[PDB]
Amino acid sequence: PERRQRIIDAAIRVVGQKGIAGLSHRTVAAEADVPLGSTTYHFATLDDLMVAALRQANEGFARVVAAHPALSDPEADLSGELARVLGEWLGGDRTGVELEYELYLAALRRPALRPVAAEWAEGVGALLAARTDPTTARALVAVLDGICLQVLLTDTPYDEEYAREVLTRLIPV
Amino acid sequence: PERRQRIIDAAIRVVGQKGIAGLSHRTVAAEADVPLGSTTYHFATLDDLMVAALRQANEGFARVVAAHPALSDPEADLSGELARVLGEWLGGDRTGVELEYELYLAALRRPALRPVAAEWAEGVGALLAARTDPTTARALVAVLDGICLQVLLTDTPYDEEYAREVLTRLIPV
Ligand SMILES: CN(C)c1ccc(C(=C2C=CC(=[N+](C)C)C=C2)c2ccccc2)cc1
Ligand SMILES: CN(C)c1ccc(C(=C2C=CC(=[N+](C)C)C=C2)c2ccccc2)cc1
C-alpha cells in the first residue's frame, strides 16, 4: 500500500522468521526496503510497531467472526459455528497459519503486547456470554485456545468434527 | 548441586528474565558464575542446555502427577483430581509459576524444543486415554492448555471450582 502498510507488512514478515527479538527499525527498513527514517517517522517505538501489527491481525480475525452472524443466532448450531470459524483459518495454509500463531504466543509472553494479543477472546467471549452464560463463555474460549495449540504444535491437521464434538460437550442443556 | 546443576539452574534463571534469545554460554557462565569452559564442557549446544532444562521441568511436573495416583483410580473424581493437579502448581507462587509457563511457550515455538515442551501432555494424555477414551483424553488435554492460558495471562487467580466444572462437562456418562 502506501509505505506505512509496507512497513507493518515487513515487520510481520520479520517476526515470522526471526521472532520479535530479531525485530529492529533496521530489520524492518531493510525488509520493507524503505529509509530507516520512514520506519521511525511512522513508528516511534518498536512496541508501537508491534501493537500496530497485532491490531491488524486482530482485525483480520474479527473479520471472519463477523462473516459468521450465525454465531449469535440462537437457532444456529453454536459449536458447529465455532468449529467452522476455527476451521476457516486453521484449515489449509499450514504455512502462514503456523506463523500467525507463532507470534500470537510470542506476543502474549510480552508485558505490553499481551493485552492486545488476547483481544480476540474479548470479542468472542463477549459474544458467547450473551449467547450462553459467563461460565460457558469462558470454558468455550478456553478449549478454543487449547485446540489451536494441539493443532498448531504438530503435523496434526485440524478436524472440525472433533472440535464441534468437544465444543458441544461444553454447551449446557 | 554440583556445577552441572548449577548451570541448568542458571540457564533457567536467564531465560526467566531475558527469554531464550538472551541465553548464551556467556550469559549462563556469568549467572552460574562458572568458567565459560564448564558450560561448554557440560553442554556443547545451547539446545542441549535448553533440552536439559525442559527435561528437568517435565520431570518436575511428572512428579506432581505421580503424587496423585487417584488420577488413574476409576472410583476417584477425575475432574476433581485434574483440577487439583492444576491448582497444585497454578495455585500460589504467581511469580516463579508465571515464569515456568513463560518458557513452556517460548519452548513450544522452537522447532527442536517443542517436542519436549509438550511431553507433559504425553504422560497426562496416555493416562486419561486409558482412564476414559481417546477423544475425551484429547479434549481434556485441550482445556488444560486452554485454562493455563486464561489464568497465566491476567491477574486472574486460578479457581479450581471453575476448572473442575468445565472439566466435568467433558467427561462422558
Ligand atoms: C487461539 N485462538 C482462538 C486464536 C489465536 C490467534 C488468533 C489471531 C488471528 C490473526 C489473523 C487471522 N486471520 C487473518 C485469518 C486469524 C487469527 C491473532 C490475533 C492477534 C495476534 C496474533 C494472531 C485468533 C484466535
Ligand atoms: C499447560 N499445561 C497443562 C502445562 C504447562 C507447563 C507445564 C510445565 C511445568 C513445569 C514444572 C512444574 N512444577 C515444578 C510444579 C509444573 C509445570 C512445563 C513443562 C515443560 C517445560 C516447561 C514447563 C505443565 C503443564
TrEMBL record, chains A, B:
Alphabetical list of SUPFAM superfamilies matching this protein: Homeodomain-like, Tetracyclin repressor-like, C-terminal domain
Regions recorded as binding DNA: 24-43
GO molecular function, one term: transcription cis-regulatory region binding
Keyword entries, A-Z: DNA-binding
Pfam families noted in UniProt: TetR_C_31 (PF17940), TetR_N (PF00440)
Superkingdom to which the source organism belongs: Bacteria
InterPro entries, sorted: Homeodomain-like_sf, HTH-type_TetR-like_transc_reg, HTH_TetR, Tet_transcr_reg_TetR-rel_C_sf, TetR_C_31
Residue ranges constituting the HTH tetR-type domain according to the UniProt record: 1-61
Protein name in the entry: EbrA repressor
Organism: Streptomyces lividans
Biological classification of the source: Bacteria, Bacillati, Actinomycetota, Actinomycetes, Kitasatosporales
